[PDB]
Amino acid sequence: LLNNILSVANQIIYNSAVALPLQLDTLESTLLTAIKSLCSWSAALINDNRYINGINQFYFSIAEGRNLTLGPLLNMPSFIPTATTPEGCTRIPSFSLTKTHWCYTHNVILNGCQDHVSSNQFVSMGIIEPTSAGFPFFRTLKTLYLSDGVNRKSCSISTVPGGCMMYCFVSTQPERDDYFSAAPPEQRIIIMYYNDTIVERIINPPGVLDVWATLNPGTGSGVYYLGWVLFPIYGGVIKGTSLWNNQANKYFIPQMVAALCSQNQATQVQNAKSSYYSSWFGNRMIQSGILACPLRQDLTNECLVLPFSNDQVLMGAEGRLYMYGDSVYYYQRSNSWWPMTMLYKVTITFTNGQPSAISAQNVPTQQVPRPGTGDCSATNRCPGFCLTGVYADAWLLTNPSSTSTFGSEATFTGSYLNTATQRINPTMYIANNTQIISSQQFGSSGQEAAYGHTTCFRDTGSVMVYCIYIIELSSSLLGQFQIVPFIRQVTLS
Amino acid sequence: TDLLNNILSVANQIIYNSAVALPLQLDTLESTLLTAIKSLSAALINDNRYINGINQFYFSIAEGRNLTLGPLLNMPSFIPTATTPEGCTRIPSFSLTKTHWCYTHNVILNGCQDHVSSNQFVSMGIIEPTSAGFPFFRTLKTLYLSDGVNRKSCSISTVPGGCMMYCFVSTQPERDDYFSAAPPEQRIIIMYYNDTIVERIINPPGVLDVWATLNPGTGSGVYYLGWVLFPIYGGVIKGTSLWNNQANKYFIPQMVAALCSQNQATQVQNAKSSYYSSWFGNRMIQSGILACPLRQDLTNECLVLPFSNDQVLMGAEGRLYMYGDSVYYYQRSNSWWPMTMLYKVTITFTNGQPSAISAQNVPTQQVPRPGTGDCSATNRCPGFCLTGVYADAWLLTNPSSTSTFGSEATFTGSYLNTATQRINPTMYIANNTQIISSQQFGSSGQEAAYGHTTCFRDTGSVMVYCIYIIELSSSLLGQFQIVPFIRQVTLS
Amino acid sequence: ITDLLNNILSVANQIIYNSAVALPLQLDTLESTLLTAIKSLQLEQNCSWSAALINDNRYINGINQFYFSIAEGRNLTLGPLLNMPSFIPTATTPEGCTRIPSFSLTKTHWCYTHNVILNGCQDHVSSNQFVSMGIIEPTSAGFPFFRTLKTLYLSDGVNRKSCSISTVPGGCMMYCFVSTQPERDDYFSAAPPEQRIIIMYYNDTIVERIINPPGVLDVWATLNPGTGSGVYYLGWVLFPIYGGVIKGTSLWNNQANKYFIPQMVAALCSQNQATQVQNAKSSYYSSWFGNRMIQSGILACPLRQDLTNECLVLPFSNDQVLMGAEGRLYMYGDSVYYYQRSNSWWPMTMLYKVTITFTNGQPSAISAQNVPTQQVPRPGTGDCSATNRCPGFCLTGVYADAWLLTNPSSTSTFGSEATFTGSYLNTATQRINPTMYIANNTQIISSQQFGSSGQEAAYGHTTCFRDTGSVMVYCIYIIELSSSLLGQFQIVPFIRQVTLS
Amino acid sequence: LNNILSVANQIIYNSAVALPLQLDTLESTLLTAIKSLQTSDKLEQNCSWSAALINDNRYINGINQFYFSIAEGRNLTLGPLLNMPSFIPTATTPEGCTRIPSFSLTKTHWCYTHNVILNGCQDHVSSNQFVSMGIIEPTSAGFPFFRTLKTLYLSDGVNRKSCSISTVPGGCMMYCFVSTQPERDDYFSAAPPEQRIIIMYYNDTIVERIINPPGVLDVWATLNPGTGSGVYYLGWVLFPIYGGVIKGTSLWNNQANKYFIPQMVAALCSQNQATQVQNAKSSYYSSWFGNRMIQSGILACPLRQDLTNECLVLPFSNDQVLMGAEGRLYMYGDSVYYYQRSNSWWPMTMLYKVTITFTNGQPSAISAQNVPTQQVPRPGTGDCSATNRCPGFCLTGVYADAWLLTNPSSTSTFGSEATFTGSYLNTATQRINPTMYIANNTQIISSQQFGSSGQEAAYGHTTCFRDTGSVMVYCIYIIELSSSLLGQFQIVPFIRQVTLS
Ligand SMILES: *[C@@H]1O[C@H](CO)[C@@H](O[C@@H]2O[C@H](CO)[C@@H](O[C@H]3O[C@H](CO)[C@@H](O)[C@H](O)[C@@H]3O)[C@H](O)[C@H]2NC(C)=O)[C@H](O)[C@H]1NC(C)=O
Ligand SMILES: *[C@@H]1O[C@H](CO)[C@@H](O)[C@H](O)[C@H]1NC(C)=O
Ligand SMILES: [Ca+2]
Ligand SMILES: [Ca+2]
Ligand SMILES: [Ca+2]
Ligand SMILES: [Ca+2]
């Protein structure tokens, strides 16, 4: 025996966790495609046939991943609005794409890039349709501008059937002051349907009052998973709470640190433990996690807050959730001591139809660094307390689970700021665990930039993968920043 | 001993997958599917604050003297930019009525000097107030015409339910259009909010064998008494009725005489000759209006109505406007007179069809436009010229309110403030003889091109806002970025 | 060990349970709830179903074919005229005029159209255009009735002229140009007239569009449909065209030096090859019509309801065809054929097999092989009468198409013995004495003049088909006749059998 | 611990075979049902809807009304003939005979029919019957087009004769008898000919029924529809009829000693009053036609697809009406009117208002009030020509109906000044000189003759209606004209304006 059931009961995990959920996923797509072929209708809000089957997947096998190269930039009419004054500040994009449609949002501040009193939030939704030269056009089918005195900040957006769910917090003071007060900022979820119904709810997740000093959405896309909307969150946890106590003495050091940090192992461990706690931000434990909301117009306390185990994950930061086939993935901003791209496979367990636990498996990487200040520049390799960095997510082009060891040879794409400490030199790239294998810098040396959001998808007609690279660029002319959706091909060379 | 622990650890995951993960997946697959099949113009309306503030003269003559430009206001630009360094967006057209707005521009992938192959972007939407009190141009639909047809020089106009765009199809360099005796393909595209699109080749009567070429003027058309009026211009062939009827006619604006010292005979002779171009195939260069009835089955119902050359300068690009019930025309100064040309247009109908047009100039010596050679911003004397740039203007007071038409008129727009170069974009308010308020955008040397200006009133706050759609030379993305600046015209 | 054995059994049993009855059950429940949501989305008392628009079983397999063997072709004669209720409308005043029929019949139905002039034939300004469609059904006497299922009357003040029509599935496609000045002025002026495609369905949808085929503007001074039927072929609608081409264009240059002399002229004209060749070359160029090259061709249109510039113009090579003229397209099985009106120096019936070559799904070239004949002349003026045999420039003639009763391709040499039928005006110079006939390459073997001598007539369109119930071939001869009582000119659908003897 | 392969193989097979097979099958069921909706909406694309069969808005409110006031009636004149594409089909051989039209127009649409005989105008064995239906729409010149939307040709060996037609919602009802022998023989035999009602709907449903109204058999030796239109009235279709009644029957008995002498006859006939009354009584009996009482009447049919004997025969009182003859029924607003052809001694137009009384939802009685007239004669033979004024037995005349332009009820004395229009053969004894006219009780006030002197003609059916859009009244005059070139006859729908000038 022994050897007989092992591979068989392993073939049942494959049968149940990859084979059947793929058949179901594929099933949903062919029926969707079948539905559109049956007063601007909501059935206008469906992507071209060419893309419905090429969204939220790993597009390349491990072998193909070796030969990937960036095509040249393609010109399309940007769906992202710019500022119309020099001091107008458009920042903090969030972008989500499903089989049917996409959602986009960003924050607008009228005068400069700091304002804890008033801002507005632009939202749009639309579809992808092919042009004449074959390449995609992001067709906006609706916009909204939430401008009503509620300072909605750090918003994450996700597609839902029929429209968008956006998750925001309401800013009334400087970020540091949120870490020091005991009560958290107000949390809101806004649902915006293509049929023009808009319902906004102030939400009260259990386990948040008197536990989390502050709580923010991660700014990167949420995802629609099993009838729930999952959003990335982070914040500050108060001392002496159960969550705090349950997280005590936990730390996570990524697989490739040991060979790169010459500091002694015991000191690495003590430094890594100390890295989840910020004296600057009110002596709170800085915590990443997921917020799970059921898709309902009647929301109050049904949303769940689920923290990641600090054994599995770095200090709390902005982030993004993804769906690749049937697995959920999490990008965590590197706001701590490890300056390399952080991607995890997230296992979610439901109990009584509800998410009750999450678990994170890192894709071990030493590639694509991020600028930071002080002792936590792109060159640091050693655990310690750091509170600095920048958002730069990454899209997985190959399946980390395709290798016998998880993520042994992983391939991903995104943008990054190629410098040690400054926010300059935005560079689009494709990378593996150890090396950048394809790269093109945008603009001249010293060109300023900030956050970068990357999303890829396949035209199943031309069998082509495109990636959109949404980058905040410093504008010399109009606006402090111009959020640009670069689009280009990821080609098998 | 130690395979039994992870054989039941695994067999509990198979319980989970079959009893939780998969049935939840099925519940959700059922859920999103039912939603998609559940999906099987009362919105597309401007806010109450603007519906009664559109297409009017906003100020009295007396008030006009105290108008000044307010600071630029920050709204989300509804005009899409390029996403490559060489990407080119050019030739905007913007139209706003009571219920909604329409917008369009031309997109060239490989730089602004490629004149074959392009795409045309279109959007429409409404205006709503923001918490700071100023307007937001809310886009409710976009379209990208990208089928390989080189649609060029497009004008757009709102219609009830949507937009009507007038384009021509360019298949050869401009100059060849004037030389060939067969005119280019003319198209009318109608795009409704309900996502119906109808596009048709039109052939107005009296075009074939009369007009060597014909273009929309790029400025907005207007919807007037059931018809859609677009500006047009082009080249008329020697020996036709239209050429003959137009023979010996010429127009010299009121204010030219005091500024030009040539003998009257020379001015007249030179003015007669400015309507004819040896460079463009010896055609008479001609301005007019295209009148289309609003229908979805257009072939030859659209009418071409030339202006008399006694009333109007050499044919050029232009724009139509509605102020109350009066139609006005802006005519680009592509000839010898470099100042802003605005006219009240009187349209006569015979048996339900526009049969004639007449133009009365608002006499002006203000807001020059850069041009080459002897036809720069400083020229004051009649001659043949084929140079200039588009720079429309919005009348803030009624030229009909004075005893003599246009004796004290006030208008606003952008212009490029140099003699010969297209640099230094400046938003201004002016009267007939002087600029009374002006704000340059960017630094000296900032390159720019066309500018479309449109004003409207917030009847909640009684503030007038103008949008100045300016074509700006860009260093970051694209060779050009078309920007809709917005600011108050303030009474002080 | 007992714990962690008995555990699996009852657990792996629940898995069998989950996978065999529990999960398939949720699948059945799922299927039912959305089949009962798909059906829940969706009138025959009010419907005239388009399978009315179906020819009778007696004709569906008898249309667009060669009906006789070469041997049977020698023994064909015309039967007596048969009386049906004409489907072609006449005038209601003495001065009304109907002219220029076009008629198309395929497997399922027929289409018909003609031009209506209110005040006499001489008025070429303003007219209206009558359109009809229907099917054929047998009568109790055994012969066809052309049953009209819809009429239309295009009457909006637009001067639609020279219209050709073709069936399409579900209806008709008509091709017209718009006339705004006399014919000769169309050749002189450098911009072509407006072209239109009108699609009319049995379901009452009508879309009419102006079209602009590539390579027309600044190349064709004018362009007309040839008035003969177009055909529906491989998803495209082909129409005969003609017009005048401007000097120094690619097309003019590409035709330079080309001419065509039919295979039987040599035995009939007694002039040295040098002059015959030079005169043939010249016959393609009309000084009277603005020094244009007068040119034949085919217009190819995709069947779609949003036409702008997809229609293509393909000229015939002048090495293969005579001077441009009115014409007609045919289908005999899978082969396209072209009849070309003899408006030039050769007065005999001109029929060709057309080879159409495609490229990327679009037609790109046409080749024409003549069926060499010397029979059925047509009346003309001056030196280009019925009796003329020599090359040279002429601009006179009349439309007189002909239907092929046997296959030109069945012989060793193409067209060495062809049999065709039509009508013709049996005089040399006048439009007089309409005569229905059957003829081979050299002789008229069966002929029946209609009316008294001096009876005035004009165009003739002939269409044949077979009753597969009785194995009888019927030909309909649509002839323009001078009228007295009502109208100045009338168009009549004569029908008779073509019988073997 | 060996049984964990018996289950493990059932786990795999369930998740790898059983479930993917089911998910695949389940997918097909959903797509079959989705394509089922794709197919159902594509059926609608194959339909011409009954909604097509509706007159343009300009005419809908302009139908079946008195158009002019009494005073406006004095200033009416005929406009020039207008030219439209005739909806009435002609013959395609010289001997083909089209005769006996019937035409019915209502709010929504019109119905037309006539008889076709293949060889000559005489036949009692075989003929066919053309039928059509359609609408009226305006042209650019402003005047109507009668647009055909469906045509039928009943050709099946049943010799349908003397057909009258009427519109019904969504189509037409036609009434014919079946002719198997000469007319005279019908009057001599006791059993009447076969009577048929055919209903023809736009949706293509056709139901023919042989009918047997009570009170016919052994009472009427023969019975024919009037040929003139019927009308659709309060759910019933009414048809004119006439025929020969048998001696000794209740109807004959109840009609004995009745007669009708029009109000304007005394002043015009010198004969002794006793000699007049005697002849008027005798004028209802034909010794030539099997010694029968020649009777006019009306047949009333419920609108049902399953008719047998629900149809009713209601004769007119011979005190109220002349000898039995062809005729026509009208709706002017809510009033039913009746034209009786003048086949007897009095050669002038006979119009009557008809009152129909209903007994429990069924017509039971009819009465006729004559519009007193001495205008519009009709040709006849011997002592009953257009000039004759004195009672006697005549059996001669021709069908020539009339449309009332003004309301005879709008004067104190019913029809003291009435205005009507039609055509008539303007000669004393012969069928020549067809003339369209407007007349009042005593004089013709407007008149245009058609064709040359001696133009032969026969029946004339006249129908007027109003373009409410332009406020013009138009009258269609359907006249059988002798033809030479093609056909014995050519039935023509002349149209002109009746202008208030
Ligand atoms: C999308 O919205 C359009 C309106 O905003 C709508 O167009 C309207 O469509 C009807 C029929 O197509 C037009 O109808 C006319 O009705 C008859 C037929 O000619 C005449 O009696 C009238 O005089 C008139 O001509 C309307 O004119 C047209 N409205 C406008 C403003 O153009 C489209 O039909 C809509 N598309 C869909 C999917 O329904
Ligand atoms: C809008 O759509 C959602 C589902 O997509 C539905 O639940 C909601 O009630 C809809 N609102 C309206 C007004 O249709
Ligand atoms: Ca706080
Ligand atoms: Ca040209
Ligand atoms: Ca021409
Ligand atoms: Ca009998």
Numbering used by the authors:
A (entry chain C): 64 to 101, 111 to 565
B (entry chain D): 62 to 101, 114 to 565
C (entry chain A): 61 to 102, 107 to 565
D (entry chain B): 65 to 565
What's the publication's text?
Paramyxovirus fusion is typically mediated by two glycoproteins on the surface of virions: a trimeric fusion protein, F, with type I viral fusion protein characteristics, and a receptor binding protein variously named HN, H, or G depending on the virus and protein functionality. HN proteins have at least three functions: (1) they bind sialic acid receptors on glycoproteins and gangliosides at the cell surface (hemagglutinin activity). (2) HN proteins are neuraminidases, which catalyze the hydrolysis of glycosidic linkages on terminal sialic acid residues thus destroying the receptor. (3) A function common to paramyxovirus attachment proteins is to lower the activation barrier of the F protein, presumably through direct interaction, thereby triggering a major refolding event in F from a metastable prefusion form to a highly stable post-fusion form.
